[PDB]
């Protein structure tokens with residue numbers, strides 16, 4: 001019995017589709033905040049349960065009798081609130097007698113300068129307190145954050161504008177990260193282990209721009225700018241202030257080597273990784 | 285304005301008595317679960333407020349307008365519950381706009397084999413997420429845990445019985461640890477810093493027994509035993525099972541070097557440390 005929180009979200013939806021290739025739908029439980037959004041899952045053989053991280057009682061019920069739990073992190077912007085939610089989740093899983101928990105954390109968190117990394121470490125320590133056999137799935141930033149349909153704005157202008165400088169990026173796709181979680185949940189050998197699930201073929205924004213140029217046939221350059229120019233760029237392109245700030249801070253951190261370390265853990269878990277060109281062409 | 289949680293507890297009571305030597309009672313707020321227990325504090329000039337870690341709303345009210353908060357950890361035996369409580373506390377302090385927070389953690393936590401160390405690390409990361417200027421007061425085990433009026437049972441029998449083997453102990457008194465917290469709250473220079481507040485004159489249970497012999501005039505030896513012999517010893521001396529287990533696990537960890545690392549941080553903060561003989565004679 002494998003339960004997946006965040007099941008209607010992007011990552012959780014992909015996990016379930018990967019689990020559906022490995023186990024009967026019978027064994028999969030989707031735990032979800034909005035039960036009406038989960039109908040398509042229930043049309044597949046997947047059991048749907050209500051579980052809201054803000055409501056301990058819902059989590060008690062949702063985790064009842066689950067063997068393996070994949071706890072996908074909350075997306076909230078308030079990190080201090082996210083620590084409460086995650087704590088509620090961990091306490092509910094302990095009380096429910098969950099037998100194995102996997103948690104989607106953040107690669108190389110101890111060296112991060114992004115405050116969200118402190119949430120993932122707080123949560124990993126919270127899970128260690130339960131004594132439940134664990135797998136810490138320490139996910140890179142998503143390649144999809146940087147490479148998406150929004151790249152058409154850059155083809156248009158001839159420029160990818162960021163404040164990442166020549167920082168290196170070890171991102172991987174949500175889909176490879178979903179496969180990794182599904183792999184771990186469906187095979188032995190991953191108990192009490194941490195994996196830093198990142199690329200071993202990192203890239204730069206110069207390189208991304210050369211790739212976009214090759215694919216589109218149109219000349220695009222990386223235009224690196226300052227933090228304040230980025231946030232301005234973003235706000236004036238219709239990106240709401242808090243998210244524009246979040247985004248500039250992620251690029252700023254990249255410029256300082258936040259995403260520059262690599263591991264073979266993911267490749268060892270899922271096999272060959274998707275080349276960035278292949279992801280760029282899909283995005284377009 | 286300096287607020288102290290756990291104010292009717294042993295450590296918090298001593299902190300307030302130390303703060304009373306440094307600031308008018310006007311500026312001190314005792315935050316407390318049981319308001320009737322705090323009357324003696326209110327007879328001094330100290331403001332009493334209700335704050336229960338299980339009740340977010342109480343904490344919102346209790347932390348209103350406080351400048352500096354000393355968050356003394358919860359004593360609960362359920363570590364997973366303690367993570368929820370501590371998270372509630374941290375979120376309340378962020379919401380209340382607390383300007384500086386000190387938290388009593390556990391020295392060298394990253395190297396601990398005691399599960400309570402994961403709670404203190406989860407909490408430190410929770411505090412880092414708030415961005416509030418912090419002081420992590422990483423307290424050694426209390427010398428008072430080992431050296432107390434209970435040593436008369438050992439004088440009686442001629443033996444201190446433990447499963448600590450010849451493990452080394454860097455413990456310090458609750459009172460020195462209270463002085464350290466009070467010092468930090470009342471002088472500049474301690475913002476965004478962690479201190480491992482332990483002894484630089486560690487001791488063994490052989491040594492404790494020689495000291496008890498010198499003080500009492502009666503011959504007492506350390507009798508080191510196994511984990512299961514300890515727990516049995518303890519249970520049959522009227523120590524309730526969960527606490528007997530807690531105690532055997534603390535000694536077991538000592539036997540494996542849990543308390544063997546030292547730092548000059550405390551001595552640098554408070555001046556000379558209390559010799560163990562002086563603490564033994566007080567206990568008796």
Ligand SMILES: NC(=O)c1ccc[n+]([C@@H]2O[C@H](COP(=O)([O-])OP(=O)(O)OC[C@H]3O[C@@H](n4cnc5c(N)ncnc54)[C@H](OP(=O)(O)O)[C@@H]3O)[C@@H](O)[C@H]2O)c1
Pocket residue numbers: 006007008009010011012032033034037051052053054072073074075076104139140141142145174
């Ligand atoms: N590594 C990265 O680059 C990266 C980037 C962004 C996010 N993340 C983290 O990884 C997680 C998964 O990524 P994603 O792309 O799948 O994000 P996503 O599409 O935003 O999914 C977030 C999921 O969490 C659910 N959720 C929100 N609040 C909840 C609550 N109170 N109780 C229960 N569920 C709640 C959402 O439910 P609804 O559908 O009902 O709203 C949604 O299913 C995110 O939650 C976030 O913490 C990582």
Ligand SMILES: NC(=O)c1ccc[n+]([C@@H]2O[C@H](COP(=O)([O-])OP(=O)(O)OC[C@H]3O[C@@H](n4cnc5c(N)ncnc54)[C@H](OP(=O)(O)O)[C@@H]3O)[C@@H](O)[C@H]2O)c1
Pocket residue numbers: 290291292293294295296316317318321335336337338356357358359360388423424425426429458
């Ligand atoms: N370093 C060590 O060797 C060591 C040893 C033991 C404990 N500790 C930790 O350090 C802390 C202080 O040590 P201590 O000797 O002063 O312990 P203590 O005498 O047991 O004090 C614990 C304090 O926390 C309060 N408390 C319990 N539950 C609470 C709640 N739900 N909301 C608000 N307050 C609550 C208690 O209030 P009441 O008086 O109303 O019950 C008490 O004032 C402990 O909480 C524990 O986590 C450290």
